Amino acid sequence: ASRILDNEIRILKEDVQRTTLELDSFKEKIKENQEKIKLNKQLPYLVGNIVEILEM
Amino acid sequence: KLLQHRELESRSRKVKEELRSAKKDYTKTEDDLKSLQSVGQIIGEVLRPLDDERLIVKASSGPRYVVGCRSKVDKEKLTSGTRVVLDMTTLTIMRALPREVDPVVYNMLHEDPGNISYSAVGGLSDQIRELRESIELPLMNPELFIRVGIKPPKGVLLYGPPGTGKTLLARAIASNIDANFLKVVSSAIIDKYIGESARLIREMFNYAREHQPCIIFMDEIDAIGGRRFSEGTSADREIQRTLMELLNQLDGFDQLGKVKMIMATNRPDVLDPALLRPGRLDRKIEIPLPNEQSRMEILKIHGAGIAKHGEIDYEAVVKLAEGFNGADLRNICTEAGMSAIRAERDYVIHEDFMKAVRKLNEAKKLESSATYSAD
Amino acid sequence: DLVSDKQMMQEEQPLQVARCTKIINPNTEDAKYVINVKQIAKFVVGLGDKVSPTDIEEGMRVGVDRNKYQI
Amino acid sequence: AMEVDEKPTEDYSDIGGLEKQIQELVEAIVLPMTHKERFQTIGIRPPKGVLLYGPPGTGKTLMARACAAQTNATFLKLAGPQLVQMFIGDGAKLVRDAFQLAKEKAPCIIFIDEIDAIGTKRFDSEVSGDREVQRTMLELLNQLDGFSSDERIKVIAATN
Numbered sequence: 001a002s003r004i005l006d007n008e009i010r011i012l013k014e015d016v017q018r019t020t021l022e023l024d025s026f027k028e029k030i031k032e033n034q035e036k037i038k039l040n041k042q043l044p045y046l047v048g049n050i051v052e053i054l055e056m
Numbered sequence: 057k058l059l060q061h062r063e064l065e066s067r068s069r070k071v072k073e074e075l076r077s078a079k080k081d082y083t084k085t086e087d088d089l090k091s092l093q094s095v096g097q098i099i100g101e102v103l104r105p106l107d108d109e110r111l112i113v114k115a116s117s118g119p120r121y122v123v124g125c126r127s128k129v130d131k132e133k134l135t136s137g138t139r140v141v142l143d144m145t146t147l148t149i150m151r152a153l154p155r156e157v158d159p160v161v162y163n164m165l166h167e168d169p170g171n172i173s174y175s176a177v178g179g180l181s182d183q184i185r186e187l188r189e190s191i192e193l194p195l196m197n198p199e200l201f202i203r204v205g206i207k208p209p210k211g212v213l214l215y216g217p218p219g220t221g222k223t224l225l226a227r228a229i230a231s232n233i234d235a236n237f238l239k240v241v242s243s244a245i246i247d248k249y250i251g252e253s254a255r256l257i258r259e260m261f262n263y264a265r266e267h268q269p270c271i272i273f274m275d276e277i278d279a280i281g282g283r284r285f286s287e288g289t290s291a292d293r294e295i296q297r298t299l300m301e302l303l304n305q306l307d308g309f310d311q312l313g314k315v316k317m318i319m320a321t322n323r324p325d326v327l328d329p330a331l332l333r334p335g336r337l338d339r340k341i342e343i344p345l346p347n348e349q350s351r352m353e354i355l356k357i358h359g360a361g362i363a364k365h366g367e368i369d370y371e372a373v374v375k376l377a378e379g380f381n382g383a384d385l386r387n388i389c390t391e392a393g394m395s396a397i398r399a400e401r402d403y404v405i406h407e408d409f410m411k412a413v414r415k416l417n418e419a420k421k422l423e424s425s426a427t428y429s430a431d
Numbered sequence: 432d433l434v435s436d437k438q439m440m441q442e443e444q445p446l447q448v449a450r451c452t453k454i455i456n457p458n459t460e461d462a463k464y465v466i467n468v469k470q471i472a473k474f475v476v477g478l479g480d481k482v483s484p485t486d487i488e489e490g491m492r493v494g495v496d497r498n499k500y501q502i
Numbered sequence: 503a504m505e506v507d508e509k510p511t512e513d514y515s516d517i518g519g520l521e522k523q524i525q526e527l528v529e530a531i532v533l534p535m536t537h538k539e540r541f542q543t544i545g546i547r548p549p550k551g552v553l554l555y556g557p558p559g560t561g562k563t564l565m566a567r568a569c570a571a572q573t574n575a576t577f578l579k580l581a582g583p584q585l586v587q588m589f590i591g592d593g594a595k596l597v598r599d600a601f602q603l604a605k606e607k608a609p610c611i612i613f614i615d616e617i618d619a620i621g622t623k624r625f626d627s628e629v630s631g632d633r634e635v636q637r638t639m640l641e642l643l644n645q646l647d648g649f650s651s652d653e654r655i656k657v658i659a660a661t662n
Binding site: 022 | 063064071085089154156
């Protein structure tokens, strides 16, 4: 058992990176939600028809 | 040994996937963060440019100001009357778009999925050939008519007693392009708005000019046509104006070439004197009640999905079917099942049709019996 | 006489016009009421804090907050 | 408002002396409405359109109220003259919305009582003639069957 240590170190580094990625995603979701809901506070809106959808 | 690396990689792969999924989910929402930060642009129709940069266009709202365009929008590409977006907050030209689409136009454009085949149509084989020569023969080789010395047919209206089923003729004729056809009931095109009644017609002729090969058929044409208005109603003024606008757009200082319109009406006597003129109504092809052979052909067409016994003598019924209307044969075929539905007789006997014909002949006793008058 | 400094400042400053309009119908899964004006415009609006959710009659004449555009 | 939600309670026996009419009509609406496979096997388009005429009180409201409580669907109640308006063609829109709301619940029946209001025979005159009423009649005809019709519901009409 010689190469087992390198694999264990790599697995630990991957787990540490995954924890940080999960934390970053949790932190980023709050910013997106604060704006999405802030816009959702605008129930007062307009009701109209649909004309066309071009390719631009 | 390397067997230990495979076990450890199973955690690194999960760690990477758990980060990639979270990043994709966060980016999905963050996209809307910048997407919902813009503002729309008002759309107007240009009148004319006054200076090399000064142009006058009326927006979709009303009173029109004069504004400029972006310094790279190919000013010459801004047609005199073009439809483009303005700097809604600034009211300046930003980008141009094709002509309008009149969502009612789409609504009446791709709302007919009928796939009628000429085999289904019957009783008007000579009428089928005439109508073909009426509309599709022109698009086939109008040079033939030119060499003849006359212009191709302008527009043909279908004359037929009520319940004749002319509408089926148009539904089948829709089997020549299936994308180059136009069918408007000529009664939903009316509105109580200020002037949109003429707007529908304008959009019709515009969308027609847009695609060269296409036909416009307008059933219930007897409604908007009418005879005239004696100052009776406050819509007859607007209704008569709509009728005249269609008359004008027909052959008014402009020919709608590569496209002809076929209309149908049960009452050719309440038709305005103008619509019957050679410029508006080209030729009148009248669809009469089915003949004995026509009635038999119609019965056979409708007699497709009948579980019966090999004794169905349609000849006796056909001789019995006197003065029946075109839809009447389908009604008899349907009532055949209803009689068969009674007693739960799975097969259909020749007696079921013999009783359905008798029931139909007695039901229509309350009719009017006034076919038509082509004057 | 009542509306001189307080009552006028109470009959006027306290209340709002709250123009009246017509309702079409609410949308399920939420309050999701629809605002519609006969001569002004239609719009997605909501009722006020001083109304009940059992009385959300579809097609009902009512006034909305002149600013909040809420019935 | 054309959505029947009060469940008009009427019994078939509570209909006086019209058992023949009940048998003739129910099988023309109820049977296609409760046993589709029966018509699907033999093969026929389900009968569409039921028009009842007769004396002033020969009984049409009774048959309609019985049919309403009979079928397990939603019946559409429309008054003959009810579908009109001073606006140009507003009746056409009111009838199109009626047909759409009826399509809302595929299992449903729409009854146009006093069909004589819109069923008035067309006339030939310049001044007047109820052009709007004829337009509403034509809109009903178009929505009924023909170009882009539907076979999902049955309409029971009552004319005097």
